[PDB]
Amino acid sequence: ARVAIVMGSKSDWATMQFAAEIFEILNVPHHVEVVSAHRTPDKLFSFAESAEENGYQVIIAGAGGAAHLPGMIAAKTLVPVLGVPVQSAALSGVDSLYSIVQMPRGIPVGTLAIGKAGAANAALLAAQILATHDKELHQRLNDWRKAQTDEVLENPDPRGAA
Amino acid sequence: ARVAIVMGSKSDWATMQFAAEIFEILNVPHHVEVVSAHRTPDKLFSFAESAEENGYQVIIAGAGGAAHLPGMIAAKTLVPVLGVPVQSAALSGVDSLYSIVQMPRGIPVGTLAIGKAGAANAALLAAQILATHDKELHQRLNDWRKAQTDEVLENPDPRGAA
Amino acid sequence: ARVAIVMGSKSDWATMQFAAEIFEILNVPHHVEVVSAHRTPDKLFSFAESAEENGYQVIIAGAGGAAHLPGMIAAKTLVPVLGVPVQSAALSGVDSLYSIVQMPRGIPVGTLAIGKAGAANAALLAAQILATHDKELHQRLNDWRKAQTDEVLENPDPRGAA
Amino acid sequence: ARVAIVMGSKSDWATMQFAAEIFEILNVPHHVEVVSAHRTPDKLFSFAESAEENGYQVIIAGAGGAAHLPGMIAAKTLVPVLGVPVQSAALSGVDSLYSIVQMPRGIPVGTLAIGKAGAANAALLAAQILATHDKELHQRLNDWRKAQTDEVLENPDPRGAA
Amino acid sequence: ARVAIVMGSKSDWATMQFAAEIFEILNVPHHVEVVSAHRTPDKLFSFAESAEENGYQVIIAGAGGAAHLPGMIAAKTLVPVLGVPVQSAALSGVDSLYSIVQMPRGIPVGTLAIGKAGAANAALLAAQILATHDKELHQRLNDWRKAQTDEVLENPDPRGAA
Amino acid sequence: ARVAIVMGSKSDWATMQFAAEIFEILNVPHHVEVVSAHRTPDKLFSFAESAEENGYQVIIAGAGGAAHLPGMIAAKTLVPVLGVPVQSAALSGVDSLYSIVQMPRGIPVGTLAIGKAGAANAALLAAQILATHDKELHQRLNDWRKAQTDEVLENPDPRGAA
Amino acid sequence: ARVAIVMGSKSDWATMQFAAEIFEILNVPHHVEVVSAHRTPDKLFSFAESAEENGYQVIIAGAGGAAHLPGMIAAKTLVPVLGVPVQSAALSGVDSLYSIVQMPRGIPVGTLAIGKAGAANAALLAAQILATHDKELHQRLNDWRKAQTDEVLENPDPRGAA
Amino acid sequence: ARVAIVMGSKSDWATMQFAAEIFEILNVPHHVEVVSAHRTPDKLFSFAESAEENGYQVIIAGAGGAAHLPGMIAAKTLVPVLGVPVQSAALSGVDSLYSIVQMPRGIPVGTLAIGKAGAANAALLAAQILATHDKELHQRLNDWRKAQTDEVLENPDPRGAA
Ligand SMILES: Nc1c([N+](=O)[O-])ncn1[C@@H]1O[C@H](COP(=O)(O)O)[C@@H](O)[C@H]1O
Ligand SMILES: Nc1c([N+](=O)[O-])ncn1[C@@H]1O[C@H](COP(=O)(O)O)[C@@H](O)[C@H]1O
Ligand SMILES: Nc1c([N+](=O)[O-])ncn1[C@@H]1O[C@H](COP(=O)(O)O)[C@@H](O)[C@H]1O
Ligand SMILES: Nc1c([N+](=O)[O-])ncn1[C@@H]1O[C@H](COP(=O)(O)O)[C@@H](O)[C@H]1O
Ligand SMILES: Nc1c([N+](=O)[O-])ncn1[C@@H]1O[C@H](COP(=O)(O)O)[C@@H](O)[C@H]1O
Ligand SMILES: Nc1c([N+](=O)[O-])ncn1[C@@H]1O[C@H](COP(=O)(O)O)[C@@H](O)[C@H]1O
Ligand SMILES: Nc1c([N+](=O)[O-])ncn1[C@@H]1O[C@H](COP(=O)(O)O)[C@@H](O)[C@H]1O
Ligand SMILES: Nc1c([N+](=O)[O-])ncn1[C@@H]1O[C@H](COP(=O)(O)O)[C@@H](O)[C@H]1O
């Protein structure tokens, strides 16, 4: 597996399952793990330190509220980190988004949309990255995009059949 | 020193100097250090792990933007952590505030106002905490508050002298 | 009891019960009372004035909307005040958060997350403060944190059993 | 004087001077005082308790950030309170506005615009209230409004003279 | 009737009924009418022009979204106008609040909280205004406030009976 | 003139001059006038009522803060109204934008960007509308757009000459 | 058909159906199509390029989140474009609104309210535009507006019958 | 060059120069071009269509306000796109951020911080991606990060020399 999907809590799985779905569709081997900067800080450090050796080329990290997980991983590895802001209850993911995207100069995290759209798109982006060097994966992405496009094109009128 | 003041960058000093000022006024010994979760992650872990042994009873941490520093310290010590959101340029500290205050259940950070007001108030709160067991410090806080109150009371009319 | 939990309305109890829960778990004696700056202003003043004599070393105060209760207590005692922003209907606690955290220089309130996460974390922070001088309580916090960490570590994969 | 203008700090005078200006224009006797819920809580209570006896029929209160002053006065008198949110630095008065307008059922504060527009309009509203029973003041307001209207009507084209 | 309650739509009644409730409780005669600046502009002008002659001393106006009704009434009468921001669906009354409170210098509207709290408080404020010259109404407000206070004081503990 | 540019205050001219500029460039005859819903309500009604007879086919209206002008014109004429939110000081035109765009069903206002970009674009949109039936104007818009495009295309590299 | 209604997804139809409703009421022939800048970019370009030839004089475009559809159409035709921000889940259409209204100088989109109110108002505005040159349509709009006004006027009291 | 830096306007260069700086530091060959979805739509399509053939493995795109450029490129190529929100005047890049990050499922853009921090971090992320397969570049990133870390570690005390 060349991609790891991690998240701050098991309660984030309802969101992050949409990243894993994309990888099943595109036949991308992936790791899935609950890793919390706040509740499991030492495992976070260990996970981030061993990511390259473990063969990860992209890491997708999701968290809600004061969403530190993606940034703290990015601080401890040169493996590209993609951040998914989970939709929090009070602030509807604005807290998650700001906590993730607003990284200082030197430690980037590529941030996707709040919520399930973002989880899916994080997997698609990870796939696009891997596809630069994986021609079979490149073809499969190409095919999947064409399928999305064609479905829309085949159904131009949203109204009831008549 | 029973209090440590730390911050994510030397550029935060313009703000965090107002915390140190309060400690000079109240004669509270304190440590001051640049500690970054993002740029110096290992030192953050070491600092947090050794805080109790080093004699710290309150930690004041300030950072801007994706402000992870206070929360990451709080994840690694039981010493109370107080967070100061530094006023960021684009988002005027809303990013800092959300990144600090919105901690998940289990790892608290007591958050103060955005900016220099918050830095001062973090020192005052740290002092109030210490004062529960330090009667001389308690008296000095009491005296300082009375001085603030009396100044306002002595100057009820904001208009020009006439 | 060395901690008081107060709130602006009985309707805040749905939130503030999560602070009291933490104290039951950690065996921390505590007081619970509805105290409103707006509806019971004189009792607020009396409560704040008598807090030290009554043996309180931390006060946790929660309120929604124009959330003045924590700050008004803090104006009238040197006992540390922790503020919990209750999640209001229209503004989802942004009004509560701003009303609490944005205190002027001289009168601090250590603010926690909007909602039930914040109520819990306020109790945990109060506990961390008390634990500086209460070794048995310190051990119990330590044990509780390890239990949270270990649960996450013991359940790394959020997916269905297979 | 049937109106009192109060504010949380002398630094608020730059804003609240625009309320006093309106009263000078309309020849309305008024009191001006720095009264802080946070720095002078006891004077706040005394001021609010004695407002009716002192002859006040409207109170205009201004404050910035965690702006508790108007609401705390309103909690302690039946004299109508009008609130002016001062434009704070970080949050540009959104904190002031929310802290003032979002009062719970039972204790109203009539809130005006953030900043100097609001200070002026608070005085005008206070004047409109008083004018219900003061025919000479009613005429003077009427005349002042006509003067504003006529100035605009007399200058329909904003372009340079030609 | 010395107070009129108006609103932009019949759909606002769910909110504005809480203003009328207060007047029933305090025995304040009042008028209730749907008046829209957008859908009935001419009636708005007629209503505002005839308000003084019709005996109104306070007008309470409520509207949602682009909430122009209160301000447009205030532009056309010297009778004090109080504005109630109705909680809109998308923006949860932030649009309503801004549209109402942010009036330019010369034309004030005293704004209350978003939603049903605001509707009630608008009636209470209108009552406080009228009470300056209506001693029987003043007593009734005083009694009602004491009843609210006493209820809270009589029920200090929010927990289940035991 | 088939287009009128109006604004709530002469202070809005700094912004609305960018609409007039576009009309000078495209040789579109236009009217310019300060018309305020708040300060000149009767003239607003008269202006809106006579717009069709006066030959206006688009009206561009700009205002800041509680920006009622565009919507109140739209309530009183079937001539299409385009709204320009002026950038207010405290809220940076969010108040202006919400006050303009959030119109209820039945009375539309086509809203453009906050500030000078919006003023220009309002004139361009008005021009596009008129161009549907004015072939010479259509050509001139076409030419102006090509000029903008070509300038960008002719300068692909933003770096210093070397 | 002189108006086209397009939208980024079939899921937007729940909103955009309220635009089509207005056209049915006013007997305005219209086209309806799902056109996505993101999922069908080439069809977007083709649609925009052929709009004038196809007889469209107004285009109404709706989309949610990162709502690029209206602006990308406007970049590729001189036919006036009206934008409808669909109410997104996390951000309640603030993302949609900003993505649509905040167009740079040169490429306007006339933006309506978030959600179903906006969809209706976009159709009404399109109709007002067309009505400048379509006297029968002008009469029908006039009649429809009078019907809305009269309904409100005929039902001034929102209370229960008695 | 395996990376292209593009932006909506020459006025964005003040921001995007910080991306190019990182590439100069790390000796990464790169292309720089003004490409606008709004002002040069056809060139955008051509650029995106030819990106893979032209040898680009990452594209960094920056734009302000209604920031469509990154997303429209991402719609037309499988080459990973990274988005930089430029800090707009009115909304301080919140419009830019929302327009970029909130992409629907299927078309991702990895978004970085508002402003110059984001531009730098976009280049660093692009570099991290390329470094997965470029060992010399990997070493250079590693060295650069160590240099940043060491500088902070070498300067722990922000206070004046004494
Ligand atoms: N932000 C965060 C981190 N962290 O940054 O490491 N760990 C958990 N959290 C968040 O707390 C939220 C609540 O988790 P829980 O209390 O429901 O387990 C989740 O969205 C999770 O991602
Ligand atoms: N958030 C953060 C962390 N961190 O959380 O560890 N370290 C630095 N930063 C922030 O980046 C900001 C910019 O720092 P600099 O780039 O000016 O050094 C500071 O406000 C600093 O606190
Ligand atoms: N803010 C406030 C204060 N105060 O600051 O003292 N007292 C009650 N409130 C708030 O009104 C809200 C509504 O209370 P109720 O009207 O449901 O009793 C509660 O969240 C409560 O904390
Ligand atoms: N909010 C508040 C209160 N209070 O509510 O009582 N007292 C002062 N403040 C505010 O602190 C701000 C800063 O005051 P200062 O620190 O510059 O004196 C002022 O805008 C003032 O109104
Ligand atoms: N803002 C406004 C005005 N106006 O300002 O005059 N008239 C109705 N409205 C608002 O449209 C909203 C929707 O009304 P309706 O479409 O449900 O009848 C209401 O909250 C109402 O106050
Ligand atoms: N909103 C408004 C209206 N109105 O809606 O009719 N009239 C003036 N205003 C606004 O007050 C602002 C301040 O005007 P002034 O006080 O500087 O003359 C302007 O942006 C103007 O458009
Ligand atoms: N913004 C956007 C574009 N585009 O701008 O072209 N296409 C679809 N979308 C949006 O994605 C949202 C989710 O669509 P879907 O994933 O439910 O099909 C819709 O509101 C749609 O308008
Ligand atoms: N958003 C946008 C696009 N587009 O998305 O293609 N093109 C230019 N813009 C933006 O307009 C802003 C103003 O450009 P200008 O008017 O100063 O040339 C820039 O930040 C630019 O990125």
PDB file of C-alpha atoms and ligand atoms in Angstrom, chain E residues 7-12 35-39 44 62-70 86, chain F residues 104-105, ligand 5:
ATOM      1  CA  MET E   7     -43.570  42.129  10.168  1.00  0.00           C
ATOM      2  CA  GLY E   8     -42.548  41.495   6.578  1.00  0.00           C
ATOM      3  CA  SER E   9     -44.469  38.252   6.171  1.00  0.00           C
ATOM      4  CA  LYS E  10     -47.140  36.095   7.828  1.00  0.00           C
ATOM      5  CA  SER E  11     -44.348  33.487   8.082  1.00  0.00           C
ATOM      6  CA  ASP E  12     -42.618  35.814  10.589  1.00  0.00           C
ATOM      7  CA  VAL E  35     -46.440  45.336   6.452  1.00  0.00           C
ATOM      8  CA  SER E  36     -43.746  44.616   3.794  1.00  0.00           C
ATOM      9  CA  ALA E  37     -41.311  47.186   2.380  1.00  0.00           C
ATOM     10  CA  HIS E  38     -40.839  44.866  -0.591  1.00  0.00           C
ATOM     11  CA  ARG E  39     -44.418  43.508  -1.230  1.00  0.00           C
ATOM     12  CA  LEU E  44     -45.316  50.889   4.392  1.00  0.00           C
ATOM     13  CA  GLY E  62     -39.476  42.162  12.298  1.00  0.00           C
ATOM     14  CA  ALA E  63     -38.146  40.724   9.075  1.00  0.00           C
ATOM     15  CA  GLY E  64     -35.825  38.051   7.679  1.00  0.00           C
ATOM     16  CA  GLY E  65     -32.995  37.949   5.126  1.00  0.00           C
ATOM     17  CA  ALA E  66     -32.579  41.324   3.424  1.00  0.00           C
ATOM     18  CA  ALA E  67     -34.560  42.812   6.329  1.00  0.00           C
ATOM     19  CA  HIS E  68     -35.369  46.366   5.158  1.00  0.00           C
ATOM     20  CA  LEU E  69     -38.762  46.840   6.899  1.00  0.00           C
ATOM     21  CA  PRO E  70     -37.550  48.357  10.251  1.00  0.00           C
ATOM     22  CA  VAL E  86     -35.958  36.794  12.121  1.00  0.00           C
TER      23      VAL E  86
ATOM     24  CA  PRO F 104     -37.248  37.535  -0.676  1.00  0.00           C
ATOM     25  CA  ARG F 105     -39.118  35.795  -3.463  1.00  0.00           C
TER      26      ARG F 105
HETATM   27  N1  LIG I   5     -37.299  41.041   4.367  1.00  0.00           N
HETATM   28  C1  LIG I   5     -38.609  41.051   3.996  1.00  0.00           C
HETATM   29  C2  LIG I   5     -39.411  42.140   3.749  1.00  0.00           C
HETATM   30  N2  LIG I   5     -39.070  43.444   3.747  1.00  0.00           N
HETATM   31  O1  LIG I   5     -37.973  43.811   4.235  1.00  0.00           O
HETATM   32  O2  LIG I   5     -39.994  44.278   3.600  1.00  0.00           O
HETATM   33  N3  LIG I   5     -40.665  41.720   3.467  1.00  0.00           N
HETATM   34  C3  LIG I   5     -40.645  40.379   3.632  1.00  0.00           C
HETATM   35  N4  LIG I   5     -39.407  39.962   3.949  1.00  0.00           N
HETATM   36  C4  LIG I   5     -38.947  38.664   4.397  1.00  0.00           C
HETATM   37  O3  LIG I   5     -38.938  37.524   3.583  1.00  0.00           O
HETATM   38  C5  LIG I   5     -38.964  36.383   4.476  1.00  0.00           C
HETATM   39  C6  LIG I   5     -39.642  35.293   3.693  1.00  0.00           C
HETATM   40  O4  LIG I   5     -41.018  35.596   3.576  1.00  0.00           O
HETATM   41  P1  LIG I   5     -41.941  34.533   2.773  1.00  0.00           P
HETATM   42  O5  LIG I   5     -41.324  34.436   1.397  1.00  0.00           O
HETATM   43  O6  LIG I   5     -41.867  33.248   3.528  1.00  0.00           O
HETATM   44  O7  LIG I   5     -43.280  35.205   2.812  1.00  0.00           O
HETATM   45  C7  LIG I   5     -39.614  36.811   5.818  1.00  0.00           C
HETATM   46  O8  LIG I   5     -38.705  36.562   6.906  1.00  0.00           O
HETATM   47  C8  LIG I   5     -39.892  38.306   5.597  1.00  0.00           C
HETATM   48  O9  LIG I   5     -39.712  39.154   6.784  1.00  0.00           O
END
